[PDB]
Design a protein around this ligand. Structure first.
Ligand SMILES: *c1c(C)c(C)cc2c1nc1c(=O)[nH]c(=O)nc-1n2C[C@H](O)[C@H](O)[C@H](O)COP(=O)(O)O
Ligand SMILES: *c1c(C)c(C)cc2c1nc1c(=O)[nH]c(=O)nc-1n2C[C@H](O)[C@H](O)[C@H](O)COP(=O)(O)O
Ligand SMILES: Nc1ncnc2c1ncn2[C@@H]1O[C@H](COP(=O)(O)OP(=O)(O)O)[C@@H](O)[C@H]1O
Ligand SMILES: Nc1ncnc2c1ncn2[C@@H]1O[C@H](COP(=O)(O)OP(=O)(O)O)[C@@H](O)[C@H]1O
Ligand code: SF4
Ligand code: SF4
Lengths: 652, 689
């Protein structure tokens, strides 16, 4: 390990504790929370193995009078909640990390749909959520504030019993009661908790003092904030968690910061900017990031691509995925691990057909298991859809999905890669490899079928119609000045907006038509949706919402208002159709059709994975490839579940 | 009576239902998370006299599931203890116990399990939220597996104690609908094409299940009565041919609408009995009994459906939530005591927000296990004797009703001459008349009580309250719509030129505006995002105004997506000529115009108008409470032991929060201090070892 990285492995004090290094996994959600607690705990345990010196839970609701159901985070309302949390703290500490819990009172962000308590805030206003929920908060009175302090102390004591070394008060992102007292928008009080900055930070100071009094002898208190608050409270917590100028200059307390390169980390510390390197998503993509820097294996780091698929798992309450790391939140469920494969079985040879994200991850994971792997790719480029999409506006970071796998595979002696090999069933049978994985991808459809239409729509064949594949292959003229292009987006994730930007940059007049109330609808779950709308408007794109396309005509499209059914035409010179995709499965069907020749050929099994099985986002393809590698040679489970799961404990 | 027909027994396969009252499968916002709450709620239906009681849909396989929605699961043996608690509760009082089994098919994205979704034909998944995944087409072995998975679930269901299994195929949802519909089933093998092929899957599953458990278990099929997808929807006419062709397939036909939006008809858009046309005649096609729904709250409608041969069973979901004792009250000749469903669909919002459902009419719904509440029994009076309830809105009325049933001497003081507060005013607005049943139920119930005195024209002051010497006071004094534009977009007052005419919903409800607005343009600024804005726009339109509705949301009446009213509201407003401006706030009200902002870009533009109908948010009427708190030192001499504030006067919210708050007050009076303990029970996850 190069000496410029040694500073990252110096110990750092946090209140009564010492962290073994500067790698600090900040609180982050995972889609399991209080529903899937053994999954969350084991995931935290993998961070412990990975070398993180500090590990935090997601936010934990510390009282039944404020909660944000349907979101699933953690709860610490009663003694019942301690065992699940104790399992998490235990896992954090096995390999030397400090165990942290984040406590939250959502305040004016919590409608209390589950508990049905009256919501409480500094001032009486409508609740503030993503979804315009139809309830208001009551203004806290003085006795409420005393209770709220007591409730935080109660949760701190339970946190000690649950085995946590650090408590973080969630006061960032405009979320929670600490932000609400600090903000003059939400805190319009005129008593001693409002008005002056000293009054607006009184609650925060009273909570911290009360917690220090109760457990400060064994437990550190951190404050996470998103700045005169500094001069006045420089030494209030044991640690400032920033989600700088004065905190560094006025406070004797350590600081952690986040910001999605070991050289940058070391410089931030060397230059006196940070004491701790805070990470959420980089630790999800690579839980062993600290360990790989410690051992000088910087070339083996799996980089976050910033797709925010992990966030969609919290927004859909469904256990988060990571595009780069398919083992994320599958450690307890399936025994998967980001740096260890299960032992090789009895078979020896595998053919992987197609070098997209699915085939690439299958190849990487199988070779690490010990199989001899041949990867056949029909074109002269690795990466499949990622090699093509990475060239589109705003998607270049996704190339790390290929580059990581290309690099890892290049280091393996048990992998051979063939380009220009569009395999037939005859080819595959001739090779006599024992197991075949068909990862042959998919194509965007030309017949308009997706959601609005389930059978081909009326299309005049004189209209120019491009799919995203045509655009990626540069079928369209480089210069579209003078032309109007309707982008029909019945996909509702990212491709429609990306295609509209390609057309915009080519000089077209661009009209984006989507049946949804939102452009790039599902990117609401990645929190990107607002910025996408603004970029398209800045590009001059004309956004037509709540509007389907019922027919493509000679010089126009017919459209429908999705509520009323009323129809109207939009003139255009071409239609860029972003409908849905059809699996490329002919080769698989050809091999299944000749299943009888397999034994003679030496083929034991043929499976179809990734987009060739069922089109989905890229993270589903890396997942399917990893799953194929994990399941090869494992025994039949019949009708058993391939994952563990916990259910509700019946009260007696 | 004409109602005797409703209590005749009816055979369902090997079982006999003791009467014709049939609780169709319905969700509750608890499901697999809060199974003891769901179980106890089913037990109350048993007490109430239902002859058949069903669970909500239960996912019978891990390769198809609809997370984040929380229904039930039957994937493993682990799942059986919770279901057995439900079937046990169903049967205590003689109901048959039914479980509904579902395979969501092209509707199930598998976000939780990460299995590949499966469907008859390969298409994008079809959900509310445009999820970015597609289903793979079932192959023959998949179909054999799926049948086996249904058999496995049927066997687990028998072990869990259920008498009936319902195969879920309604609301356009699930694999049985998907095989029947030519839109979703484009196969060319023997499971596609002809109606006979498209119903092959159903025949094979039913046969397989009967073979396994048919000696002790009846099978019902819940069917979509109509579907529209281009020209390929499974039409009501086609449904009729399916039934005729398969007349002896299930033990019972459970008939429901082809979308949830259509089936759980809001009272604002659908009258009672709305599915009769879709259903009439079907009974003639099969010799198996038929259940249907229609927001049945009128016993006369119920008896007619059976007498005129439309239905064998009166199916109820929401009427049984609002009044779980509806069958017993008809049996005992207390029709006047029925708590009628108002068709607000607040119960559905609990499923859509995964949060345990409320009922506007029945605040005890899904609080039976959590808090010991019961729709027809109050806890016994404690040691105190007198209670003053100030305000006769939904909150004060429910507190009064429930307190009198505990035995307290209750005085109810109301400032106006009318009972009902906001409901007495809102019930007169377009489409909200059925919501008036919230007042009428409570008004009637209180009129039968000898321990309640009601004072009108009595706007109480704190001095009045101290003078009366009642032991406990509940301040239920409501709220007012704000005139300063504050809600969500603005948290402090917006710029408002005082020369512009600005009406709030209170003004409109008081007829402050001219009855005839022909020739005038009215901007409705909706920053409330539930129902009032759209209702106000309809009032203005009906008065003849040119109406422009401006809202910062991407949807008109945004939160009514959770009540399933949203689409019909948009269509109604468009039909009325309302000009709907979405994704647009109001930044200022000027002399003859409002300034608006595109919420994404910030770009500003003005809209001319003669008046602004401001639908912002509400401010609690809490002066009286504050005055009394300020004089807390005088309470002991005055004899006052406690003063609490409830309902909109505490924190404005929908009407159901107010009936909830009143009931909660009545339930908690004189109860022991719990300290920092929870006032409700709750279950947590069972840790695996
Ligand atoms: C949820 C998830 C899934 C992620 C990616 C972010 C997130 C999540 N939950 C959080 C929580 O419960 N409490 C909290 O304080 N912050 C939470 N975050 C934000 C996260 O801590 C980081 O601040 C951001 O992810 C940015 O840092 P980085 O990811 O670039 O390293
Ligand atoms: C949930 C809820 C909250 C309601 C009101 C209806 C609903 C819900 N869950 C259902 C389920 O899980 N399976 C099923 O088949 N139907 C479900 N429904 C619909 C309900 O069964 C009724 O069909 C409608 O509500 C109409 O009947 P009614 O309420 O007018 O009597
Ligand atoms: N018959 C074939 N033989 C070899 N490679 C193929 C064949 N058919 C398609 N391919 C390749 O398979 C890959 C499919 O990858 P992609 O579309 O990204 O799928 P996924 O997202 O499922 O990984 C492409 O790189 C494509 O060139
Ligand atoms: N000082 C008072 N004394 C008696 N009644 C009052 C007083 N102030 C307001 N009210 C009444 O209280 C009721 C409030 O009802 P409402 O606004 O519907 O509240 P909620 O929805 O909380 O029940 C109204 O009927 C109103 O006339
Ligand atoms: S899902 Fe995407 S953004 Fe989140 S950690 Fe993985 S690669 Fe990074
Ligand atoms: S919430 Fe409304 S619609 Fe649902 S059962 Fe109760 S009164 Fe009926």
């Amino acid at each position: 390990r190069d000496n410029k990285y040694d500073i990252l492995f110096e110990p750092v004090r946090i209140g009564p504790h010492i962290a073994k290094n500067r790698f600090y996994q900040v609180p982050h959600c995972n889609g399991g929370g209080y529903r899937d607690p053994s999954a969350a705990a084991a995931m935290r345990g993998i961070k412990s193995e990975g070398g993180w010196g500090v590990i935090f839970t997601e936010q934990t609701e510390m009282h039944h009078t404020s909660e944000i159901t349907p979101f699933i985070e953690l709860r610490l309302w009663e003694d019942k909640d301690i065992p699940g949390l104790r399992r998490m703290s235990d896992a954090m500490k096995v390999h030397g990390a400090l165990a942290g819990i984040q406590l939250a009172y959502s305040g004016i962000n919590g409608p209390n749909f589950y508990t049905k308590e009256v919501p409480l805030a500094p001032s009486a206003l409508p609740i503030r959520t993503f979804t315009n929920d139809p309830v208001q908060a009551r203004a806290l009175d003085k006795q409420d504030i005393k209770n709220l302090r007591r409730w935080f102390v109660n949760a701190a004591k339970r946190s000690k019993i649950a085995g946590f070394d650090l408590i973080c008060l969630y006061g960032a992102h405009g979320f929670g009661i600490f932000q609400h007292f600090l903000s003059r928008a939400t805190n319009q009080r005129t008593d001693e908790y409002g008005g002056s900055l000293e009054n607006r930070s009184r609650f925060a100071r009273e909570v911290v003092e009360d917690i220090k009094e109760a457990v400060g002898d064994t437990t550190a208190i951190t404050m996470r904030v998103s700045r005169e608050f500094v001069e006045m409270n420089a030494n209030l917590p044991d640690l400032w968690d920033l989600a700088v100028k004065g905190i560094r200059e006025l406070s004797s307390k350590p600081v952690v910061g986040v910001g999605r390169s070991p050289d940058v980390m070391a410089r931030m510390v060397r230059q006196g900017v940070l004491d701790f390197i805070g990470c959420a998503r980089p630790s999800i993509a690579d839980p062993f990031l600290p360990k790989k820097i410690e051992e000088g294996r910087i070339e083996d780091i799996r980089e976050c691509i910033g797709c925010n698929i992990c966030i969609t798992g919290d927004m859909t309450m469904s256990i988060s995925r990571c595009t780069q790391n398919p083992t994320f939140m599958e450690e307890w469920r399936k025994g998967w691990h980001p740096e260890r494969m299960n032992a090789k079985g009895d078979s020896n040879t595998v053919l992987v057909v197609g070098a997209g994200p699915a085939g690439l991850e299958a190849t990487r994971a199988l070779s690490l298991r010990g199989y001899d792997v041949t990867l056949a790719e029909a074109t002269t480029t690795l990466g499949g859809r990622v090699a093509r999409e990475r060239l589109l506006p705003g998607l270049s970071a996704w190339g790390r999905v290929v580059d990581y796998r290309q690099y890892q595979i290049s280091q393996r002696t048990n992998v051979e890669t063939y380009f220009d090999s569009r395999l037939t069933a005859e080819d595959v049978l001739g090779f006599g490899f024992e197991h075949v994985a068909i990862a042959t991808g998919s194509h965007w459809r030309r017949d308009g079928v997706a959601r609005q239409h389930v059978v081909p729509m009326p299309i005049d064949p004189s209209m120019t119609v491009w799919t995203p594949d045509d655009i990626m292959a540069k079928v369209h003229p480089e210069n579209l000045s003078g032309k109007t292009v309707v982008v029909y987006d019945d996909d509702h994730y990212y491709m429609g907006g990306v295609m509209a930007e390609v057309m915009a940059k080519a000089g077209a007049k661009v009209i984006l038509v989507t049946s949804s109330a939102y452009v790039s609808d599902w990117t609401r779950n990645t929190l990107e949706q607002g910025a996408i709308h603004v970029r398209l408007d800045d590009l001059g794109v004309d956004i037509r919402l709540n509007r389907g396309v019922t027919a493509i005509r000679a010089g126009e499209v017919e459209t429908n208002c999705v509520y009323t059914g009323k129809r109207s035409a939009i003139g255009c010179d071409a239609v860029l159709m972003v409908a849905s995709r059809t699996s490329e499965d002919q080769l698989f069907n050809d091999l299944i059709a000749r299943q009888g020749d397999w034994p003679d050929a030496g083929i034991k099994s043929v499976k179809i994975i990734g987009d060739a099985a069922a089109p989905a986002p890229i993270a589903w393809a890396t997942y399917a490839g990893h799953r194929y590698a994990r399941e090869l040679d494992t025994p039949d489970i019949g009708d058993d579940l391939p994952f563990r799961r916990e259910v509700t404990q019946l009260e007696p």
